[PDB]
């Protein structure tokens, strides 16, 4: 049952320290690595099943491979993904084109659809303008606090220079 690993130019099984983001390993902790035995990439009699992908169709239609088509499980969820899936434009209304799936419970046929992500909304723009206005008003408040401190230092300097120069 040991799966083949791409890049192991060998026909036998070898132990390897596997890490995050590699095949034949699902890490269970953070930064956790295991040594596992992996079949090499070289196909040979030692195997039990080959996974193959059809790159070019033949002259005959296979009974369960190519004659059939599997419906796509999920449609697009992001706004621009919907835009490029149905090819509308850079600017358009993507709410109309959202794939709605129909679910029946005997009598009530109700339709559910994904929530569009990165959708431009007044809530998003209000948050944008709020962050901008916060930055500008904090900078102005900083400038006026510095100015108030500056005139305080100038007054204190005038006090001390006059007191020390005359006394």
């Amino acid at each position: 049952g040991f799966p083949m690993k791409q890049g192991v130019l060998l026909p036998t099984r070898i132990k390897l320290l596997l890490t995050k983001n590699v095949s034949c390993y699902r890490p269970r902790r953070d930064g956790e690595r295991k040594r596992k035995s992996v079949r090499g990439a070289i196909v040979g009699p030692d195997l039990a099943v080959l996974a193959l992908v059809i790159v070019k169709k033949g002259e005959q239609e296979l009974e369960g491979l190519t004659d059939t088509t599997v419906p796509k499980r999920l449609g697009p969820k992001r706004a621009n993904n919907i835009r490029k899936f149905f090819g509308l434009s850079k600017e358009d209304d993507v709410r109309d084109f959202v794939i709605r799936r129909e679910v029946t419970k005997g009598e009530k046929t109700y339709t559910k659809a994904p929530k569009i992500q990165r959708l431009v909304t007044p809530q998003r723009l209000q948050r944008k303008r709020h962050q901008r206005a916060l930055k500008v008003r904090n900078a102005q408040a900083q400038r006026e606090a510095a100015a108030e401190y500056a005139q305080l230092l100038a007054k204190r300097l005038s006090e001390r220079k006059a007191e020390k120069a005359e006394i």
């Binding site: 606090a145 401190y149 305080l152």
Partner: protein
């Protein structure tokens, strides 16, 4: 080892919390916050053990999650929030205001203040320094960073903080004759006026303090907190005013006002 500790065993908590020896293996471990662990009073200890408004921690959490309590004008839903010296605790229900001041036995007292007193606190200036962009700032005893302080403000002085805006209203210097409050050591909770301050350059400045009845004591400067001028504090003192009666006279007034 290997990292920060999250538990506080009972018998290792600060003694001034007055937690019972039995009925529990642990004590509330104060969260990180404005006051040091040993010098703080967690909100659960205040609400449950001192004010008796809650019978257990679950009720303390129930009270806090409805946002009744507030420390220095902010809700603080945290159960183990480390409230400390001169913190203002407001309960909008019961319309009650508290300032955390030690009584003369070195324990936080249930001391009530009015709305006008609860509008502000006092902070001891822990440090004065120039920040980035050359902007001066002071750091108080409760960790508050206050930008653009008055240049006359030095370390060991006391500032009045608006507590609505984090702003200094006025300040008191550290000089002989000024009323101070002892916030540490074995004289914790005593109130008197500075007689003089001996330097000891290189370590541990000392302060000589005498109270109303001319009892003098010497305390390290780190424990000394200025609270006003000669008389007339800027805060409402608790009962006792830090006099430190002896046990004999303490007993005398016990038998005096217990027999009417």
């Amino acid at each position: 080892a290997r990292g920060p500790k999250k538990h506080l065993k009972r018998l290792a908590a600060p003694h001034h919390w007055l937690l019972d020896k039995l009925s529990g293996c642990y004590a509330p471990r104060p969260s990180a916050g404005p006051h040091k662990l040993r010098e703080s009073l967690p909100l659960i200890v205040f609400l449950r053990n001192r004010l008796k408004y809650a019978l257990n921690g679950r009720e303390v959490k129930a009270i806090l999650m409805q946002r009744h309590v507030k420390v220095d004008g902010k809700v603080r839903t945290d159960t183990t929030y480390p409230a400390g010296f001169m913190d203002v605790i407001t309960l909008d229900a019961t319309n009650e205001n508290f300032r955390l001041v030690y009584d003369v036995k070195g324990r936080f007292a249930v001391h009530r203040i009015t709305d006008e007193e609860a509008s502000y606190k006092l902070g001891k200036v822990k440090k004065v320094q120039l920040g980035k962009k050359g902007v001066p700032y002071v750091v108080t005893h409760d960790g508050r960073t206050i930008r653009y302080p008055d240049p006359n403000i030095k370390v060991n002085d006391t500032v009045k903080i608006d507590l609505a805006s984090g702003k200094i209203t006025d300040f008191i210097k550290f000089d002989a004759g000024k009323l101070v409050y002892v916030t540490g050591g074995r004289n914790l909770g005593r109130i008197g006026t500075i007689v003089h301050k001996e330097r000891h350059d290189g370590g541990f400045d000392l302060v000589h303090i005498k109270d109303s009845l001319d009892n003098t004591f010497v305390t390290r400067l780190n424990n000394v907190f200025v609270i006003g001028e000669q008389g007339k504090p800027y805060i409402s003192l608790p009962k006792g005013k830090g006099i430190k009666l002896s046990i004999a006279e303490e007993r005398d007034r016990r038998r005096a006002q217990q027999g009417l």
